[PDB]
Scaffold this active site. Structure first.
Site, PDB file in Angstrom:
ATOM      1  N   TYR A 114       0.823  -1.207   0.000  1.00  0.00           N
ATOM      2  CA  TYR A 114       0.000   0.000   0.000  1.00  0.00           C
ATOM      3  C   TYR A 114       0.854   1.252   0.000  1.00  0.00           C
ATOM      4  O   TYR A 114       0.546   2.211  -0.695  1.00  0.00           O
ATOM      5  CB  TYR A 114      -0.972   0.057   1.175  1.00  0.00           C
ATOM      6  CG  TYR A 114      -1.777   1.339   1.172  1.00  0.00           C
ATOM      7  CD1 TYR A 114      -2.551   1.686   0.073  1.00  0.00           C
ATOM      8  CD2 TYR A 114      -1.672   2.253   2.210  1.00  0.00           C
ATOM      9  CE1 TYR A 114      -3.242   2.886   0.029  1.00  0.00           C
ATOM     10  CE2 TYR A 114      -2.361   3.455   2.177  1.00  0.00           C
ATOM     11  CZ  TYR A 114      -3.145   3.765   1.083  1.00  0.00           C
ATOM     12  OH  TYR A 114      -3.842   4.952   1.047  1.00  0.00           O
ATOM     13  N   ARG A 132       2.947   8.713  12.637  1.00  0.00           N
ATOM     14  CA  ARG A 132       2.597   9.974  13.292  1.00  0.00           C
ATOM     15  C   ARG A 132       1.086  10.194  13.324  1.00  0.00           C
ATOM     16  O   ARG A 132       0.535  10.645  14.326  1.00  0.00           O
ATOM     17  CB  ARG A 132       3.275  11.152  12.584  1.00  0.00           C
ATOM     18  CG  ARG A 132       2.608  12.506  12.849  1.00  0.00           C
ATOM     19  CD  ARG A 132       3.434  13.677  12.308  1.00  0.00           C
ATOM     20  NE  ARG A 132       3.666  13.576  10.867  1.00  0.00           N
ATOM     21  CZ  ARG A 132       2.742  13.792   9.935  1.00  0.00           C
ATOM     22  NH1 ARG A 132       1.510  14.136  10.287  1.00  0.00           N
ATOM     23  NH2 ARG A 132       3.051  13.666   8.650  1.00  0.00           N
ATOM     24  N   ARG A 183     -10.146   5.955   9.867  1.00  0.00           N
ATOM     25  CA  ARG A 183      -9.333   5.208   8.909  1.00  0.00           C
ATOM     26  C   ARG A 183      -8.314   4.360   9.669  1.00  0.00           C
ATOM     27  O   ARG A 183      -8.037   4.615  10.842  1.00  0.00           O
ATOM     28  CB  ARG A 183      -8.618   6.167   7.950  1.00  0.00           C
ATOM     29  CG  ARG A 183      -9.552   7.111   7.187  1.00  0.00           C
ATOM     30  CD  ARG A 183      -8.915   7.649   5.896  1.00  0.00           C
ATOM     31  NE  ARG A 183      -8.723   9.105   5.910  1.00  0.00           N
ATOM     32  CZ  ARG A 183      -7.551   9.728   5.755  1.00  0.00           C
ATOM     33  NH1 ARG A 183      -6.425   9.041   5.583  1.00  0.00           N
ATOM     34  NH2 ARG A 183      -7.505  11.055   5.774  1.00  0.00           N
ATOM     35  N   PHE A 196      15.355  19.183  -2.517  1.00  0.00           N
ATOM     36  CA  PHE A 196      14.023  18.612  -2.683  1.00  0.00           C
ATOM     37  C   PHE A 196      13.918  17.217  -2.058  1.00  0.00           C
ATOM     38  O   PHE A 196      12.880  16.841  -1.513  1.00  0.00           O
ATOM     39  CB  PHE A 196      13.652  18.554  -4.170  1.00  0.00           C
ATOM     40  CG  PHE A 196      12.296  17.961  -4.431  1.00  0.00           C
ATOM     41  CD1 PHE A 196      11.149  18.708  -4.233  1.00  0.00           C
ATOM     42  CD2 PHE A 196      12.166  16.641  -4.821  1.00  0.00           C
ATOM     43  CE1 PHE A 196       9.906  18.161  -4.448  1.00  0.00           C
ATOM     44  CE2 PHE A 196      10.920  16.085  -5.026  1.00  0.00           C
ATOM     45  CZ  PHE A 196       9.793  16.846  -4.834  1.00  0.00           C
TER      46      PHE A 196
HETATM   47  O1  LIG Z   1      -2.180   8.878   0.687  1.00  0.00           O
HETATM   48  P1  LIG Z   1      -2.216   9.768   1.907  1.00  0.00           P
HETATM   49  O2  LIG Z   1      -1.461   9.194   3.087  1.00  0.00           O
HETATM   50  O3  LIG Z   1      -3.606  10.273   2.233  1.00  0.00           O
HETATM   51  C1  LIG Z   1      -1.284  11.271   1.483  1.00  0.00           C
HETATM   52  C2  LIG Z   1      -1.299  11.531  -0.021  1.00  0.00           C
HETATM   53  C3  LIG Z   1      -0.209  10.734  -0.732  1.00  0.00           C
HETATM   54  C4  LIG Z   1      -0.384  10.780  -2.245  1.00  0.00           C
HETATM   55  C5  LIG Z   1       0.307  12.012  -2.763  1.00  0.00           C
HETATM   56  C6  LIG Z   1      -0.434  13.152  -3.032  1.00  0.00           C
HETATM   57  C7  LIG Z   1       0.206  14.296  -3.487  1.00  0.00           C
HETATM   58  C8  LIG Z   1       1.583  14.307  -3.656  1.00  0.00           C
HETATM   59  C9  LIG Z   1       2.328  13.170  -3.377  1.00  0.00           C
HETATM   60  O4  LIG Z   1       3.691  13.169  -3.534  1.00  0.00           O
HETATM   61  C10 LIG Z   1       4.351  14.191  -4.163  1.00  0.00           C
HETATM   62  C11 LIG Z   1       4.290  14.315  -5.547  1.00  0.00           C
HETATM   63  C12 LIG Z   1       4.964  15.351  -6.181  1.00  0.00           C
HETATM   64  C13 LIG Z   1       5.707  16.257  -5.433  1.00  0.00           C
HETATM   65  C14 LIG Z   1       5.781  16.124  -4.052  1.00  0.00           C
HETATM   66  C15 LIG Z   1       5.103  15.091  -3.416  1.00  0.00           C
HETATM   67  C16 LIG Z   1       1.686  12.024  -2.921  1.00  0.00           C
HETATM   68  S1  LIG Z   1      -1.958  12.558   2.295  1.00  0.00           S
HETATM   69  O5  LIG Z   1      -1.658  12.409   3.735  1.00  0.00           O
HETATM   70  O6  LIG Z   1      -1.370  13.819   1.799  1.00  0.00           O
HETATM   71  O7  LIG Z   1      -3.429  12.578   2.110  1.00  0.00           O
HETATM   72 MG   LIG Z   2      -5.097   8.445   1.030  1.00  0.00          MG
END
Ligand SMILES: O=P(O)(O)[C@@H](CCCc1cccc(Oc2ccccc2)c1)S(=O)(=O)O
Ligand SMILES: [Mg+2]
Length: 324
Positions: free
Chosen positions: A135, A182, A192, A252
């Site tokens: 996941y 966290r 969730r 980054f």
């Molecule tokens: O899947 P989760 O645990 O809900 C998490 C979102 C993870 C999916 C996601 C969304 C947006 C950007 C991402 O990763 C990036 C993508 C591009 C640049 C920086 C970070 C990953 S969230 O805590 O931000 O909702």
């Molecule tokens: Mg999610």
């Protein structure tokens, strides 16, 4: 242009702590990685919205990548909070289409595979640890895979950066796991669960029992076990950054890892993980290394002999000390 100003406007509205590092990226990366983020942000906003029924969601998630080439598409029926990126998608998917073809490919790919992967874990919770990786792979690893293929496509990083999927994966698995960890109360009171049952289930009979103060003892034991699990990625992390050759790309990548590492250090053997909130030089590898090695010692210096994963924690810190 004005749709672009809007895209970076959304980038800041939504991104807790990438905004700055993204906008600092060199060259075509800036926008590639700005749009990339907004797209995945849209995708997640769908996945996480529990007002959207499963039969309605699975199709969205699957076909989402295809919406990138549907200029007029948008989703108006969302009740999650970051829902501007969906209501006004056409703007995003437009700037996406202005992205260079070599970038659209990577983005729409990782978008397409995250989709078939999120819809996979709607029905089921995360049972085992192989699954937790799976996941985390879907929502986070692929982002790690995807970003590094953008890096190399930009020509700002070596081909060898984007070729390395196992370690790009790790970069995200690590970040994602520390967040899952966290977030335990935030996730559990928003209803969730991402803590791996075959783990938490042999401390307590249902996961929510950790929010109970009659249980905090066993709670921290589960918290440390998982932290120790997450720590096992920190070598691949050190290997991945050691390969990067662009300051903009480097900051980054480093910053959020170092910051993920701080969070994990703050949470080790720490009640407040289940009570409330956890308050917490990184611009060249050997600084980064020093900084990582430092936080490792903090973990080390608070491993209680009693905690049933003491050997493991020490075990993996010892490997991180003497690796690379
Ligand atoms: O899947 P989760 O645990 O809900 C998490 C979102 C993870 C999916 C996601 C969304 C947006 C950007 C991402 O990763 C990036 C993508 C591009 C640049 C920086 C970070 C990953 S969230 O805590 O931000 O909702
Ligand atoms: Mg999610």
């Amino acid at each position: 242009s004005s749709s672009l100003k809007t895209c970076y406007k959304y980038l800041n509205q939504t991104s807790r702590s990438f905004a700055a590092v993204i906008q600092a990226l060199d060259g075509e990366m800036r926008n590639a990685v700005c749009i990339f983020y907004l797209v995945l942000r849209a995708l997640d906003t769908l996945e996480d919205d529990m007002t959207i029924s499963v039969e309605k969601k699975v199709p969205l998630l699957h076909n989402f990548h295809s919406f990138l080439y549907q200029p007029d598409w948008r989703f108006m029926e969302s009740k999650e909070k970051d829902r501007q990126v969906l209501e006004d998608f056409p703007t995003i998917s437009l700037e996406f289409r202005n992205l260079a073809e070599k970038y659209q490919t990577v983005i729409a790919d990782i978008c397409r595979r995250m989709g078939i992967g999120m819809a996979e874990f709607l029905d089921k919770h995360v049972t085992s640890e192989q699954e937790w990786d799976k996941y985390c792979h879907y929502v986070a690893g692929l982002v790690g895979i995807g970003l590094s293929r953008l890096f190399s496509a930009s020509e700002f990083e070596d081909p060898l950066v984007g070729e390395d999927t196992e370690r790009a994966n790790s970069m995200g698995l690590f970040l994602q796991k520390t967040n899952i960890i966290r977030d335990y109360l935030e996730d559990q009171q928003g209803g969730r669960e991402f803590w791996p049952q075959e783990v938490w289930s042999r401390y307590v009979k249902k996961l929510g029992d950790f929010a109970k103060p009659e249980n905090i003892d066993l709670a921290v034991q589960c918290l440390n076990e998982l932290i120790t699990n997450a720590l096992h990625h920190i070598p691949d992390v050190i290997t991945y950054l050691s390969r990067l050759r662009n300051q903009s790309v480097f900051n980054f990548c480093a910053i959020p890892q170092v910051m993920a590492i701080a969070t994990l250090a703050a949470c080790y053997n720490n009640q407040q993980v289940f009570k409330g909130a956890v308050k917490i030089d990184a611009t060249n590898m050997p600084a980064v290394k020093a900084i990582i090695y430092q936080y490792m010692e903090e973990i080390y210096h608070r491993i209680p002999d009693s905690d049933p994963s003491s050997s493991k924690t020490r075990q993996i810190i010892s490997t991180i000390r003497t690796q690379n």
